[PDB]
């Protein structure tokens, strides 16, 4: 598919629409919550809604380690 | 406490050291695997090693939605 | 301790709250000003306020060189 | 100039060349150190060298707050 | 000269201002379109308007590959 | 469908493998060139080779504006 190595499946538990951006919160395995801030245009075009099953995607070079 | 909203606990299952960067692979809840590319310097100062328990951190503005 | 190599201490001199995001401006050593755009949620959970002493954090792979 | 709001002037105190990437460390005001990981091609083309006076640049959406 | 390896000349065909951020859409050579989300402050300081001729800039480490 | 708003079709004209990362250069429509730095693992898993027809993908929040 795509080079981004992090692909986490989950369900939408939160949605907040802005003017330029929008926030999507997904509940994944173990009950952890992933928060995404993307364009309002993409949220609308993809038809994001509470309860939908979507996948969070993250490029490897954007992941930090806390030790 | 840091603003980055995504913080996922896991165990180190893969580690590869380059010249400038290094790759850390974490196994988190549900079997999901997180891949991180960071500086070699940080991997050495943090003492990252296979089997260690660490946390992956990702800023909300870097998470995309696939669906 | 986090892998992100850039950690700069400063004082909050500007704060603007949007619908989804928020802007924090920090004055660091030498008079330099750091601008951060993060989630509104994090700005509220952290209790960020003008005059507060906080730290700006930036991952090494996000820093470019101009010259 | 450019939209990236963070522009920090400094002097090169460290340089490490990889195969694909390279690390540049700059000393800025207050003695803080900024670490950048960019392409080896750009380090070579810009002629980066120990002691040179350059500027570190960071997009606002890549800056986190630690409180 | 900046290290960011992707520099695409274009014309502004879309501009949407928010509270904290702003969206800029550029038409570039070959019939492609680029969408940028940056600070409202930078859009105003740069004098961005529909019809302006500007350049979109992306760091190499932020570009993914889809197959 | 992914939320990333920038999707540019091209042909691979350059490939350089490192230890941890890898550099891919694509020629896109209109005579523009895109440079991507991703994981070596993804380059190998995707079967990236010179001459391949692939798509470069960038999140809107990573695109700056130069005037
Ligand atoms: Cl190794
Ligand atoms: Cl406000
Ligand atoms: Na980032």
Q: Which of D2, D3, D21 sits opposite F37 (nearest CB)?
A: D21
User: How do F53-58 and E64-66 pair as beta strands?
Assistant: antiparallel
Task: Find the ligand nearest to C16 CA.
Answer: 2
E strand map for A1-67: 6-17, 21-27, 33-39, 53-58, 64-66
Q: Which of C5, C30, C37 sits opposite D29 (nearest CB)?
A: C30
Helices (H), chain A: 40-45
In the block, residue with structure tokens 């951060």: C36
State the CB neighbour count (10 A cutoff) for residue C49.
10
Task: Find the ligand nearest to C23 CA.
Answer: 2
Q: b/e string for F29-61 if b means 16 or more Cβ within 10 A? A: eeebebbbbbbbbbbeebebeeebebbbbbbbb
Of C14, C11, C9, the residue nearest C24 (C-alpha): C14
Please report residues of D whose CB lies closer than 8 A to that of F66.
Answer: 1-3
What is the sign, positive or negative, of the torsion defined by CA atoms of C15, E45, E26, E8? Answer: negative
C-alpha angle with apex C5: B16 to D32, nearest 5 degrees? 150
What are residue F10's phi and psi, to 5 degrees?
-160, -170
SS3 per-residue string spanning chain B: CECCCEEEEEEEEEEEECCCEEEEEEEEHHHCEEEEEEEHHHHHHCCCCCCCEEEEEECHHHCEEEC
Is C24 in contact with C14 (CB distance < 8 Å)?
Answer: yes
Is B22 in contact with D19 (CB distance < 8 Å)?
Answer: no
User: How do A33-39 and A21-27 pair as beta strands?
Assistant: antiparallel
Domain residue ranges in chain E: 1-67
Of E52, E18, A6, the residue nearest D61 (C-alpha): E18
What is the C-alpha to C-alpha distance for residues D64 and C57, in angstroms, rounded to an integer?
5
What is the C-alpha to C-alpha distance for residues E67 and F56, in angstroms, rounded to an integer?
9
Task: Please give the helix or strand (H or E) that residue D40 lies within, else none.
Answer: helix D40-45
D60 close to C (CB below 8 A)? yes
Cα of E34 vs centre of ligand 2, distance in Å, is 30
Is F39 in contact with F22 (CB distance < 8 Å)?
Answer: yes
Task: Find the ligand nearest to C49 CA.
Answer: 2
Experimental technique used? X-ray
Of B32, F58, F60, E65, the residue nearest A1 (C-alpha): E65
Domain F1-67, classified CATH 2.40.50.100, yes or no? yes
Is D21 in contact with F5 (CB distance < 8 Å)?
Answer: no
Cα of B18 vs centre of ligand 1, distance in Å, is 7
Task: Please give the helix or strand (H or E) that residue F46 lies within, else none.
Answer: helix F40-46
Please report residues of F whose CB lies closer than 8 A to that of E8.
Answer: 32
* Paired residues of A11 in beta bridges: A27, A53
What is the C-alpha to C-alpha distance for residues B19 and B25, in angstroms, rounded to an integer?
18
C-alpha dist (Å) from residue D65 to B53, D31, D34, D61? 24, 20, 16, 11
* Residues whose CB falls within 8 Å of the CB of residue F52, separated by 6 or more in sequence, listed in order: E67, F11, F12
What torsion, rounded to 10 degrees, do the Cα atoms E62, E66, F2, F5 define? 50
* Residues whose CB falls within 8 Å of the CB of residue E42, separated by 6 or more in sequence, listed in order: D3, D4, D5, D60, E22, F65
Nearest CA in chain A to B42: A65
Q: Which of A23, A65, A66 sits opposite C39 (nearest CB)?
A: A23
User: How do C53-58 and D64-66 pair as beta strands?
Assistant: antiparallel
What torsion, rounded to 10 degrees, do the Cα atoms A10, A5, F29, F14 define? 180
What is the length of chain F? 67
Q: Which of B55, B56, B64 sits opposite A36 (nearest CB)?
A: B64
User: How do D21-27 and D6-17 pair as beta strands?
Assistant: antiparallel
User: How do C21-28 and B6-17 pair as beta strands?
Assistant: unpaired
In this structure, what DSSP letter does residue F47 have? Answer: T
C-alpha angle with apex C1: C25 to C21, nearest 5 degrees? 30
In this structure, what DSSP letter does residue A8 have? Answer: E
Q: b/e string for C1-35 if b means 16 or more Cβ within 10 A? A: ebbbbbebebebeeebebbbbbbbbbebeeebebb
D60 close to F (CB below 8 A)? no
Tell me the DSSP string of F6-39.
Answer: EEEEEEEEEEEE-SSEEEEEEEEGGG-EEEEEEE
* Residues whose CB falls within 8 Å of the CB of residue F23, separated by 6 or more in sequence, listed in order: D20, D39, D41, E60, F14, F15, F16, F35, F36, F37
Residue contact F2–A5, C-beta within 8 A: no
Cα of D15 vs centre of ligand 1, distance in Å, is 22
What are residue C43's phi and psi, to 5 degrees?
-70, -30
In this structure, what DSSP letter does residue A25 have? Answer: E
Q: Is residue A9 packed enough to be buried (19+ CB in 10 Å), middle (13-18) or exposed (0-12)?
A: middle
Q: Token pair for residue F67?
A: 């005037």
CB–CB contacts below 8 A, A to E = 36
Task: Please give the helix or strand (H or E) that residue E53 lies within, else none.
Answer: strand E53-58
What is the C-alpha to C-alpha distance for residues F53 and F26, in angstroms, rounded to an integer?
9
What is the C-alpha to C-alpha distance for residues A48 and A15, in angstroms, rounded to an integer?
8
Of E60, E44, E48, E65, the residue nearest E7 (C-alpha): E60
User: How do F53-58 and C21-28 pair as beta strands?
Assistant: unpaired
Tell me the DSSP string of chain C.
Answer: -BS--EEEEEEEEEEEE-SSEEEEEEEEGGG-EEEEEEEHHHHHHTT--TT-EEEEEE-GGG-EEE-
Q: Token pair for residue F1?
A: 């469908």
What is the C-alpha to C-alpha distance for residues B22 and D19, in angstroms, rounded to an integer?
13
E63 close to D (CB below 8 A)? no
């Amino acid at each position: 598919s795509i080079s981004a190595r992090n692909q986490l499946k989950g369900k939408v538990v939160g949605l907040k629409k802005g003017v330029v951006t929008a926030e999507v919160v997904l509940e994944i395995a173990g009950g952890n919550k992933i928060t995404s801030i993307i364009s309002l245009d993409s949220v609308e075009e993809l038809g994001v809604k509470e309860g939908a099953e979507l996948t969070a995607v993250v490029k490897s070079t954007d992941v930090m380690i806390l030790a």
